[PDB]
Amino acid sequence: TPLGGEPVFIGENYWDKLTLEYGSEATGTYLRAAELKHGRSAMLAVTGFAFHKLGLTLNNISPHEYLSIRDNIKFADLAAMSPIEAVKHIPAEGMAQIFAAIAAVEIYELTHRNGKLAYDESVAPGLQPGGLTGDLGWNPLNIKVTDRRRLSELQNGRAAMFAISAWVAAEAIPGSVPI
């Protein structure tokens, strides 16, 4: 009773073992939510990696290449030391900042149920059965929310995930296929 699966072929398999025997319908939602989160994350990661490999960084695309602004961290040096060895050169301040935005988003996905935050509750809205559906409601200039869009998004998600995993593996060690 889940959403559309593989377009060429379909297979649910490992789904009725937890959404009927182990868990229930509430677990179904949760699983889908997790999947969507991961998918989106993978997509963004993929794009970032692609950009880094290509060369479109601050030095190439804009007038500013000095990220550290005190730690002498230029974009040229970070674009010459690959993608995996560049994330470790990010200044602590910046890391802290990034963690902040993500934290805020996660908290929102946790407190603000529907339109506004809920002041009195035993637990957070998203910590209850079916707490997080997957959709945050963030639809700026929303073009459409149909039954095709969702499926497309999901597909792009898994694909992105696989792609980035493979990319990381190859940078690290002999993969298998070409890039």
Partner: protein, 161 residues
């Protein structure tokens, strides 16, 4: 009795030289499929292991923090000589947790034996006719039969030289 079952196939067909399902001395109508499938599944990951685990493709880095790399570990029963004995227990143990916790009929909806997951080797598979099941469950079962003679070879030929 079981001449029309899975595994009976040309050129031999039903071929029981010991008279094993010839009676129920220890309920041979069941569990002998399960004992035949289970050894071969070990052997198929063993021989697709051991041949690739002879060709020279290794994991990066070290087996621990003390610097012992994976590339220094050869193939064979010699590979267990360069496993420290704390590893030999844990290699058994969380595999031994799988025997009691996933390697049994958990949910009770098993059409067969070796039937645990139901949905993840569904490789565009739902479309295929019930006959395609009997094909690639003979092809499961007969890869596992023939990978034991692969792995019993590749264990004895190392000790024979």
């Amino acid at each position: 009795a079981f001449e029309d079952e899975l595994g009976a196939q040309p050129p031999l067909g039903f071929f029981d030289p010991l008279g094993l399902v010839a009676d129920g001395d220890q309920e041979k109508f069941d569990r002998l499929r399960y004992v035949e499938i289970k050894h071969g599944r070990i052997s198929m990951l063993a021989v697709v292991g051991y041949l690739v685990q002879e060709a020279g493709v290794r994991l990066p880095g070290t087996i621990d923090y003390s610097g012992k790399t994976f590339a220094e570990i050869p193939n064979g029963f010699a590979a267990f000589k360069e496993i420290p004995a704390g590893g030999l227990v844990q290699l058994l143990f969380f595999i031994g947790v799988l025997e009691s916790s996933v390697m049994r009929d958990l949910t009770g909806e098993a059409e067969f034996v070796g039937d645990f997951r139901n949905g993840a080797i569904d490789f565009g598979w739902d479309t295929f006719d019930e006959e395609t099941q009997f094909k690639k469950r003979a092809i499961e079962l007969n890869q596992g039969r023939a990978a034991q003679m692969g792995i019993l070879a590749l264990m004895v030929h190392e000790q024979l030289g």
